[PDB]
Please model this.
Amino acid sequence: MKILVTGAAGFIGSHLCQALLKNSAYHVVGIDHFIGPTPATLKTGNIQSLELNSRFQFIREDILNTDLSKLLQDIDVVYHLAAIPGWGKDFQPYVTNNIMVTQQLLEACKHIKLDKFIHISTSSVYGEKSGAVSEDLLPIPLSPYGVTKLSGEHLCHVYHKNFHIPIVILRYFTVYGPRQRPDMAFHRLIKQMLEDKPLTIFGDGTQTRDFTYIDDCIRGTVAALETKKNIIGEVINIGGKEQASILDIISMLEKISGKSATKNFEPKQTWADISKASTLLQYSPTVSLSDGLEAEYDYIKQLYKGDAAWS
Amino acid sequence: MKILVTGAAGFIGSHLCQALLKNSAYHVVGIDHFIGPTPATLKTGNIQSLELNSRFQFIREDILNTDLSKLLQDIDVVYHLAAIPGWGKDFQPYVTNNIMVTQQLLEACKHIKLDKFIHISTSSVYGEKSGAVSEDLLPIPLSPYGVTKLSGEHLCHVYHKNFHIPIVILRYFTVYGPRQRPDMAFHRLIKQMLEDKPLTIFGDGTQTRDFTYIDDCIRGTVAALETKKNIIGEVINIGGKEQASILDIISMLEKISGKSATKNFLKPKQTWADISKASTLLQYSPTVSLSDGLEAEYDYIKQLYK
Ligand SMILES: NC(=O)c1ccc[n+]([C@@H]2O[C@H](COP(=O)([O-])OP(=O)(O)OC[C@H]3O[C@@H](n4cnc5c(N)ncnc54)[C@H](O)[C@@H]3O)[C@@H](O)[C@H]2O)c1
Ligand SMILES: NC(=O)c1ccc[n+]([C@@H]2O[C@H](COP(=O)([O-])OP(=O)(O)OC[C@H]3O[C@@H](n4cnc5c(N)ncnc54)[C@H](O)[C@@H]3O)[C@@H](O)[C@H]2O)c1
Model:
C-alpha cells in the first residue's frame, strides 16, 4: 500500500508519516514546501528520523507548483494535512494554501483510483459552542483559518458527490505534544516557563477546552485508513481524553518543572463530541494531560536549550 | 443616507439602485466591473435610467483594483451584490470575485461606522434539500459557486464577531423578471420560444421550486435596510409567492405566446424557501404572481431578440 501525506514536515504530518511506516507493508510519500507559522529552521527537525526510513520518499515542493499526476501515480491513499493554520492583507496565503491547494489536489484525484482521500480539517470551522461540539452542528467560523478550512471541506463534498472521490473529513481539536507548532498555546507557555518569563494568558484562563495528545490524534488518523466500517462521505471529530483550563495546564506544568509562573492575564466550557469516531474508528484517546504535558515539556527543553541535531 | 451598491449594473443591483433612488433622502454609489455571463451592452442598458439621476454616481472598476477608502468615505450602508454566478482552471474567478472581493470589502468597512452591511447570498449554499429550507439547515453546497458564496457569508460573520461590522445576510432563491441574466432558465426558455425552437429542459422538469419576481426581491432587500427591528447578524431567506415546475412555467409561457412549444428533455421533487423569518423580521410578503412576472420578463426578452 502506498500513501501520500501532504504537509509531512509539519507537526501532525511528521508524526503521521512515522506511525504509518511502523507497518512494514506501507510506503509513504511526503510533500511539504516549508511555509506557514513554523520557521523552516525549527521544521527540519520534524523529519530527522523520517528520512532514515527507506520506505519514505520526501518531496520539497509547493503542491501548487509540482507534477500532481506524477505525485499521485501508484498512490492508494491521500492524507491531506497541508494548510496554513492559526487577517488584514495576510488573507491570500490562507485562500491559496487551504482552498486552491485542496481544489487542485481534488482535481488531480479524479483521474486516479483511490481507496480514500482523508482530508484533515479543524474545530475552528465550528466557531463558538458551549458544551459538546458534534458533527451535525451548524458551522459559523469566527477566524479566516476556520473560513478557508471549511471551504476546503465543502470542496471535498462537491468532488465526492460529482466525481466519486472517496473523501473522509477528520476535524482535529487542539493537538499538543512533541513538535507542537511554536504559535500554539502549550509551546508558548512552556517556552515562557523555561525562560523564567511572564506566561501570557488571554482572559481569566478558567475556560475549559478539549486537548488531544499527538499519539491519540495519530491513532484516530490511522484508524480512518484501517477501519472495516464504510466511512466515505463522513465528517469525524478527533478530540481529547481530558478537558482543562489554561490555569489547570499551568498547574500541571509547575508540577512538571517545579517552578512558579508570573501570570500575565469564550464559552466557559466546550469539548469535542468524539462518539462518531468511537463508533466508526474504535477511537479512544488514552494519554493523560500530565503524561502528554511532560512529553511536550521535555521536547521544548531540548528544542531551545539542548544540543540535538534538531536543536 | 449614502448607499454603496456593489454589482449595481447587474440584474438585481440595477433594480435595487432604481428602488432606493425613489427616496429623495437616499444617495447611491454603484460599482460594477461589467463581468460574469451578461454582455456589457445589456448592463449599460440596465443603468441607462440611473445615470440621468443626480443622486446616483457610477464607477466602472474592479472592487479589487479601486481605492476602497475613497469609495467608502461617507457611506452609511453597503449592499454587496457583486459576484460571479455558476472546474480545474476556471475556479480562480469564483475565489477572486466571490471570496477575495468580500474579504477586501469587509476589510475596508472594518474601521468605518456603517449602519448596515447587507451581504447578498444564494439558496445554492444549501445544496440538495427536500421540503421547506429554513436558515437553520446545515448548508452542503454542491457547486463551486455555492462553496465560494458560502465562504463570503462566513467572512461576514468573522468581521461581525471581531470588528462589529453590522452584517445582514439575505439568501435569494431564484430571481426572475426584466433584465434576468441570459444564462438563466426563464431568459433561455423565452428566447427559444420566440425563435419557435425546442425549449431545452435539463431533467424531466417536474421538480417544483421557488421563484422570486425581481420587484418582490427588491422590496425584501429594501426592508432589510428600513425595518424597525434589529436584524444585525441574522441570515434571512428571500423567496417567492408561487411554487412551479419548469413544465408549469412552460405551460404559462404557452398562454403568453398563444402557441404550444416543442419540449426537448436532456439527461429532488419538492423544495421551497421557508420565508417565516423574513415575514417576522422584514414584514416580507411577495405579491407578484408567476403569470404577471413571466409577462414582464417575456416583454423584456422579446424587445431584445424581436
Ligand atoms: N495543530 C493542531 O492543533 C490542529 C488543529 C486542528 C486542525 N489541524 C490541521 O492539521 C493540519 C496540520 O496542522 P499542523 O499543526 O501540523 O500544521 P503545520 O504548519 O505544522 O503543518 C502544515 C504543513 O503544510 C505545509 N504546507 C502548507 N501549504 C503547502 C503547500 N502549498 N504545499 C506544500 N506544503 C504545504 C507547511 O509547510 C507545513 O509544514 C492542518 O491541515 C491543520 O489545519 C491542526
Ligand atoms: N439572479 C438570481 O436568481 C440570484 C439567486 C440568488 C442569489 N443571487 C445573488 O444576487 C447577486 C446579484 O446577482 P445577479 O443575477 O444580479 O448577477 P449579475 O451578474 O447580473 O450582477 C452581479 C454584478 O457583479 C459585478 N461584479 C462581479 N465581480 C465584480 C468585481 N470584482 N468588481 C466589480 N463588480 C463586480 C458584475 O459585473 C455584475 O454586473 C449575487 O451576489 C448573486 O450571487 C442571485
User: Anything to note?
Assistant: The pocket of nicotinamide-adenine-dinucleotide (ligand 1) is lined by residues A 7, 9-13, 31-36, 38, 43, 62-64, 81-85, 97, 101, 120, 122, 149, 172, 174-175, 181 (CB under 6 Å). Residues 2-175+211-238 of chain A form one domain. DSSP finds ten helices and 15 strands in chain A.
